[PDB]
Symmetry: C3
Subunit: 492 residues, 3 copies
């Protein structure tokens, strides 16, 4: 007639790691690293992204003739751009502050293209000969669709003086440019006047552009360049243009109608006719898990990115095939027969045997391990969220600074995650070692010298303990005096 | 007849948090988070700040006629500037490298405005007509007080050639400007010479300014603009000016007399006629706590900023209404009667009863807990300290980079603060748990079978233990031989 | 007639720190901080550094005469620049995007200087009169040697139109310059043409340069300025020059042969004809230690920089001059006569008295301790590595951002390293305490009433073979129980 203290054991093969030991099999565990993605680009909460295909942001905004799919773009969630889009700036040149404009586009979800300066507004200039083979459309030379390349009419280029007032309540993105000719003859053939200028002015802008007539290398079949510029015209402000040649005048402008969360994603992955709440350049994430290792740059409701390969929290006890010396100590193994709890008793009397779990000790441990898991997840709610930022060829130091800043915070938070899991896993296992010892000691305090301590977690009753007597030991109501006289005689 | 082992209990309602349990009431606790401020701006160690009111740094340095309170500024501890100062640049334009100049002002505590080029030095130019209604002073057109707007004299603007040599043995801040006229008629009306230039040359500076005569929008009633520029003239270096129009000559220069710790604070709160050692834009801090959650940007000897709402370190033990089985284990509760220490004894004999504390074990716990608290404070002595950095409209990428860097370190150090407190509170509670068990076991080894283990932390003496016998147990000097026979006789 | 439970003690003076206690003397400990360097500049994995001596990068690239001739410079592991090079630009001026060029050079391991434009290509201009006293060689006026200062010939400076095509298939670094004259007379005496320009054009460059003739302060005895510019000519691309005066024309250019990890180190300590895998400006480091405190800026496979002055991990026991009550508890002191392991027994019996160690208990402690130390060595490899980034006087906001960022990451990883050692040192000392206690209880349950629990860690039994058997885990309680009742009273 004996009663024993024991703990749970199942067929689990899951393994966690600690600072002192690796690959420790446990009865229950919780993974906290999501590792899978659908490998496709999807809608973000029902909103389809804007995929520019092989068109760049500059080609879409300036109106590259090969980017005509994007003339009435619907509202977008994020913008997908291939790393090297081919339909960018058909006529060679540049877009000034292109990276700063992309930063502004990252906070915009929708444009509304509006005609600001019609071609009927240039009666004494030619509007149809600003066309080049570098910008082909359907076999014929064309040009950017949103701006107009003005050239001389009747061998004369009168000084232009035009102003547009943003009578709209929304901010206006306006683009214009200057044409760099190649020689003194081409300058005359296109704009009679030899020495030319462009003056652009607003409340804030005070810009004067002068063409650089020099010999340059051939790009896209053209030795000339076209430098473009942009500005944000505030409501009830006006832009004032003055030029006597080489003026690439605005025709359409973009009304910033929707501002919100967006990003310019560099990706060649395909749209998969799907929806998601979390999107990465490599694919979309579908998980309730607190961490992921897919990609640092994410958008939407996303888990926090880490560089880990495995991250599993220990929630149960060390499974059987010790700071407190109970689990894998004087109790050498767990019981597969005890299924209703983590800790409990095995009784053996003449009426039979059976397993019984101590619900109070088990529920206290369940509440503790649940609070620890919940505490660790909430402690990582505020992590570093990497953002995409673009820099040019002469901004390498700043680009390198942005790389080390985002990578440095990643290694810091990756280390914080793996070390907190490593440390708290050791604590969780030793927390189970306590509750078993405290359960063994609680039974030991109740039985006293009425039973014998075998040393394996079992108590050999000196008296006779039936099923009701067995339950009273588990109850906490074992009556020592009721059986003291029989135990006294049983000794020798 | 009986001696017991127990622990302290009091009326404290202070609560600490652990990883496995929150809102744990403890006997003693130390708050380490300051959450209060006086809500006013004060002097820093007896030095009053420079409060520019509605004037900007540009308006103060250039000499906006509406900023005449600051023509002689005393040495300041920090600079206070409202978010959107009204006065600023009375005549529309810009101050080149404005944010870079504000970065140099943050390392400067005092200027000495000195007159470097008098209006006497301009014999063949008009020095008293360069005024505008955009810069009114007591109902009459005026201009920036530190520069002179030179215009033509006798319908002639001879080419200016002037040089100033820094003989003041300290660095000198010099400001000058260029005026952008609106048309060829206004250009001639003010300067006669139609094509103008400004050449500024030092040992490192080689600048050429040319007016941009164009059509702009009206700002402060003026369609013209005025672009200002600055340099730091090192001692024994000379600045060379040359211009034939549109030149805004320096009159007064700022002499850097004292350099030290300062900051350009952005706040709308008012001066409170107070002194402090720590100042934030929302208020001043008078505290000895190691942490605060007032504002990230502080100046002076300050606590370390965290984003925590509560940060309480557990110093005592779980208060009564663990890993080791003592506190809230076989010892059910604490003793409100023990007030001399954390752990001790309760004796009950024929002479009477009494509460006594174990000085040795209590002092050992006090020293460890005190060293712990001091260790947690010391490891946070080197934290990230945010600094104010300004950026213009075309530095959004870097400004966003700066915000993410400073916010990322705040989240990292906040995480370290709450997690270290969360983990060490758990350890502190088990530390008290073990010390009670180690004290109960120490008496257990002394008495052996001379007393009966009650199981609740009390020992029922088989023999008679008087007041000095009870003291021998607390001393650790209990003579088991002297009473072996009586205890054996009392056992039947 | 007794066997006892005890732990190791020795003569160790090594100290560790915990959060609750400082200067704790331990039996065994492992230092994990490197604090020594050779104080020399050495080769990195067999490759000698490029030491520019008293010369700047710009002086070497442009061809300062007082600088070394720097011909056929071999492949370098890293570049060494004095903090304030005394040569730099002999003729006063500037080099556009100098810091961005040095960033590019930090990612380049070999240059090959090639002659791109011969002086034979200037028939109508003077190619030998562009010298100044500000650029002296042999006490005679000279100039930068990778660039030519073209001067008028026969009171004439005809407009120049020249092009060079990059046929090499490696990227090319080309430098040109402009002279800012002092007075209109000087302009004519040197170039005749009064209004001058320089036009430079490539596939990506569209530059126009007009001289600024003005009065300046004199530097190196010259009031004129020589402003230099650079570009990277991609393969099968051409650079096109056009100027009617004030043109400092390219003569030699630098071909990018190898692009790899390198750095511009700001050091003045001497080359020591040594080899290392880790170099700092103060000296080189040879160490397997996971941390170092020599200098933040390092090149090669290096330990991780921390601002700590001491970092010692506790691998052994609290030495005799806890959460569990064994060490410094009911066992008051350790055994110096016990040299075989951390835990074990001392026996007193018929055959003699003997100290023996429990190898199974010690090995479990050794295995866990080494696993902890190795787990602390790792999880530290992915730290922050500081890079040298340069900024000019009007980029001070960004320089402060860079400095605060690099110092912030150092302070974070310093806090992480010290707090990890403090916390795990304490857990180690308690791990030993539990190990001893569990050993004491393993024999306690075994012997039962066949021995008396003395309370000092010793058991008073009521032979060598039996003594070893209890240490094995075997004991026949029936075989030895009877004498005990008689031995009692
Ligand atoms: C663009 O048009 C608006 C609206 O006409 C001008 O803003 C003011 O609007 C009021 C309407 O009552 C007019 O009476 C004012 O004459 C206009 N402007 C003021 C005081 O600024 C606006 O100025 C025009 N914008 C520009 C740059 O010319
Ligand atoms: C473990 O047992 C469950 C049934 O209780 C079974 O569904 C599962 O397949 C088993 N898992 C393994 C790894 O054997
Ligand atoms: C732990 O398990 C993984 C496979 O699950 C194995 O690759 C690794 O070698 C194991 N490490 C140890 C220390 O057992
Ligand atoms: C055990 O506990 C239940 C209530 O939880 C009680 O009804 C029952 O009488 C107890 N039985 C014994 C043998 O103590
Ligand atoms: C708790 O006891 C202390 C001791 O006097 C006293 O200062 C305090 O007011 C008491 N608090 C309450 C709620 O009784
Ligand atoms: C802890 O105490 C605070 C203050 O009374 C209370 O707001 C909060 O609900 C409590 N939290 C828990 C888990 O009981
Ligand atoms: C300024 O004055 C000192 C002495 O009068 C002189 O040595 C120095 O050259 C002057 N500085 C310049 C740039 O001329
Ligand atoms: C620890 O020991 C060293 C060497 O004896 C000594 O320099 C140092 O002051 C000690 N630290 C403390 C806190 O006593
Ligand atoms: C350089 O030479 C190659 C070979 O003829 C030619 O293809 C290339 O176009 C040339 N580069 C330029 C810019 O002309």
């Amino acid at each position: 007639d004996q009663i024993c203290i024991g703990y749970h054991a199942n067929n689990s093969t899951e393994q966690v790691d600690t600072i002192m030991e690796k690959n420790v099999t446990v009865t229950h565990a919780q993974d906290i690293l999501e590792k899978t993605h659908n490998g496709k680009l999807c809608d973000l909460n029902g909103v389809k992204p804007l995929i520019l295909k092989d068109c760049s942001v500059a080609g879409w905004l300036l109106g590259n003739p090969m980017c005509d799919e994007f003339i009435r773009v619907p509202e977008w969630s994020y913008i997908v751009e291939r790393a090297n889009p081919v339909n960018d700036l058909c006529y060679p040149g540049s877009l000034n502050d292109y990276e700063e404009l992309k930063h502004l586009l990252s906070r915009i979800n929708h444009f509304e293209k509006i005609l600001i300066i019609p071609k009927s507004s240039w009666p004494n200039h030619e509007t149809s000969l600003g066309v080049s083979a570098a910008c082909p459309y359907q076999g014929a030379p064309s040009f950017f669709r949103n701006v107009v390349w003005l050239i001389k009419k009747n061998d004369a280029y009168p000084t232009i003086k035009i102003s547009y007032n943003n009578t709209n309540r929304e901010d206006l993105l306006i683009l214009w440019g200057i044409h760099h000719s190649n020689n003194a003859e081409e300058q005359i053939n296109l704009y009679k006047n030899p020495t030319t200028y462009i003056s652009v002015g607003t409340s804030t802008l005070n810009q004067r552009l002068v063409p650089k007539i020099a010999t340059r290398s051939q790009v896209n079949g053209q030795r000339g360049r076209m430098d473009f510029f942009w500005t944000i015209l505030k409501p009830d402000d006006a832009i004032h243009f003055e030029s006597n040649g080489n003026f690439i005048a605005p025709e359409y402008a973009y009304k910033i109608v929707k501002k919100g969360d967006s990003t310019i994603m560099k990706s060649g992955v395909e749209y998969g006719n799907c929806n998601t709440k979390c999107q990465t350049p490599v694919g979309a994430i579908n998980s309730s898990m607190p961490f992921h290792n897919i990609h640092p740059l994410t958008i939407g409701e996303c888990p926090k990115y880490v560089k880990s390969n495995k991250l599993v929290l220990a929630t149960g006890l060390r499974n059987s095939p010790g700071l407190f010396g109970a689990i894998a100590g004087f109790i050498e193994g767990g019981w597969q027969g005890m299924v209703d709890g983590w800790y409990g008793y095995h009784h053996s009397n003449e009426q039979g045997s059976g397993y019984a779990a101590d619900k109070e000790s088990t529920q206290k441990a369940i509440d503790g391990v649940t609070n620890k898991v919940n505490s660790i997840i909430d402690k990582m709610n505020t992590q570093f969220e990497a953002v995409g930022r673009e820099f040019n060829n002469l901004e390498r130091r700043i680009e390198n600074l942005n790389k080390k800043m985002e990578d440095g915070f990643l290694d810091v938070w990756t280390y914080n995650a793996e070390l907190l899991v490593l440390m708290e896993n050791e604590r969780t296992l030793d927390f189970h070692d306590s509750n078993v010892k405290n359960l063994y000691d609680k039974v030991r305090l109740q039985l006293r010298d009425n039973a014998k301590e075998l040393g394996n977690g079992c108590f050999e009753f000196y008296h006779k303990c039936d099923n009701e007597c067995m339950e009273s030991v588990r109850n906490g109501t074992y009556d020592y005096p009721q059986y003291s006289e029989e135990a006294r005689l049983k000794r020798e």
